[PDB]
Nucleic acid binder design. Structure first.
Lengths: 272, 81, 82
RNA sequence: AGACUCUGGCAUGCUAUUCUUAGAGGGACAAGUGGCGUUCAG
């Protein structure tokens, strides 16, 4: 019985009871998992930030319950892995959660397992819903950033094949993420490989990207309300005759050079 | 969020013609924004109100001599018409 | 203005049209994907449902030995249905 | 590594109207706080 704004403080309260939670509290955590995921795709950005920080601190909390950190994080992942199975919105939620978790505990998951998730995300690249494919593209970008190029190389072809047969409209909508992914792949690998295994139309974008990689190599009112050799020039002022021996002569020696709408019938201005 | 040209040039001219009727807080800036300018776009009106609130919290910390001579000039222009 | 012969043609044609006019008159006499749009009760129902589904799949013996393999097979079945 | 256009969450308000409607009017603009900042842009 928690309302939508009330998710934003509550997670923090949950956060405030994670970082000293004892080892005999796993049931509470595994009951809290879906709330944290649904709050990672909450309406409020503050609730999303709180749920992401709660996920990070909660994964940190499993780094204290066992001797093996990698096995504990594997358990933490398999507590959230079913989220890729149910309804479309919560699948997108869980892909976003895995995207956030992949950037924090980078090597500690174990790259091969990450590769399996990447393969699953490739299946999630074939979804009809735009949010799921967007979250899959975000996870792909995070994986390209994080996990190693030597392990990327055996999985370049599958992920970019899942990219290639996306759609016409879906490719047209998210051309930004596709452009950034192609730029990252061209930076990290050979341009000829990406050209060889992509279909025809994307090649056009590629050469533009390649050309891009060619191209990359005081408090006064009047001053504030403004439309936004040489320093040795002096101006005298000539009044009484100028007395160079007067102590107050420096006031007469200056250092700089001295010196759109239509109105309506009522008189109010017109702004457009 | 980054800033544009039209909102801030409109704010500059609206201050240069009606600095007397502005206030210090956001709501009075909003009210004078409806009652002075027609401003058909609500987004542009909101941005104008935000930047004029920024301007009023900025220039009121400055010297009073410029404010006094600007009020004299505005009162002279109002009395001339 | 305009030629006489064209005017004569027009007058003859309108008089002819009146002739068949009189003749005819005489003859007649005889659950969205986005969560922000969706309501709080449905979010709570979805939260309870996904809690129960997570508990059931975590209590399943198949999801204890090969978790990632089972997840991959489930996704493969789900979108080979699609 | 979209500074392009439109636009949602909340209305116990007006309109035939607190639970369904569809026109309009509001509401959020980085507005406020503390730090980093060429003390101004961010």
């Amino acid at each position: 019985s928690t309302s939508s704004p009330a998710k934003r403080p509550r997670l923090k309260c949950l956060l405030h009871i994670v970082r000293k939670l004892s080892a005999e509290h796993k049931e509470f955590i595994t009951a809290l998992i879906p709330e944290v995921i649904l709050c990672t795709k909450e309406v409020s950005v503050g609730a999303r930030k709180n749920a992401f920080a709660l996920l990070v601190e909660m994964g940190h909390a499993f780094l204290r319950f066992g001797s093996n950190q990698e096995e504990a994080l594997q358990c933490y992942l398999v507590l959230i892995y079913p989220g890729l199975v149910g309804a479309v919105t919560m699948v997108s939620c869980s892909i976003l959660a895995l995207t956030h978790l992949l950037f924090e505990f980078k090597g500690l998951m174990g790259t091969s397992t990450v590769e399996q998730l990447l393969e699953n995300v490739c299946l999630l690249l074939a979804s009809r819903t735009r949010d799921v494919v967007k979250s899959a593209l975000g996870f792909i970008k995070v994986a390209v950033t994080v996990m190693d190029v030597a392990h990327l190389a055996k999985h370049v072809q599958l992920v970019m094949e899942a990219i290639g047969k996306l759609s016409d409209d879906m490719r047209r909508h998210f051309r930004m993420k596709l452009r950034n992914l192609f730029t990252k792949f061209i930076r990290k690998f050979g341009f000829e490989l990406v050209k060889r295994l992509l279909p025809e139309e994307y090649h056009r974008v590629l050469v533009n990207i390649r050309k891009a990689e060619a191209r990359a190599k005081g408090d006064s009112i009047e001053e504030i309300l403004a439309d936004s050799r040489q320093r040795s020039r002096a101006w005298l002022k000539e009044d009484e005759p100028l007395n160079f021996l007067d102590p107050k002569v420096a006031q007469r020696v200056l250092a700089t050079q001295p010196g759109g709408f239509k109105v309506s019938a009522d008189g109010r201005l017109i702004i457009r | 969020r980054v800033r544009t040209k039209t909102v801030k040039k409109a704010a500059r001219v609206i201050i240069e013609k009606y600095y007397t009727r502005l206030g210090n807080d956001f709501h009075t800036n909003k009210r004078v924004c409806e009652e002075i300018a027609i401003i058909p776009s609500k987004k542009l009106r909101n941005k104008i109100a935000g930047y004029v609130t920024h301007l009023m919290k900025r220039i009121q910390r400055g010297p009073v001599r410029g404010i006094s001579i600007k009020l004299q000039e505005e009162e002279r222009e109002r009395r001339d018409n | 203005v305009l030629p006489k012969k064209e005017k004569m043609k027009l007058r003859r044609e309108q008089w002819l049209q009146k002739i068949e006019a009189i003749k005819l008159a005489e003859q007649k006499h005889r659950r969205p994907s986005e969560l922000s749009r969706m309501s709080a009760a449905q979010r709570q129902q979805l939260l309870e449902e996904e809690r129960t589904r997570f508990q059931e799949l975590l209590a399943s013996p198949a999801y204890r030995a090969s978790p990632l393999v089972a997840i991959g097979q489930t996704l493969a079945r789900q979108m080979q249905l699609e």
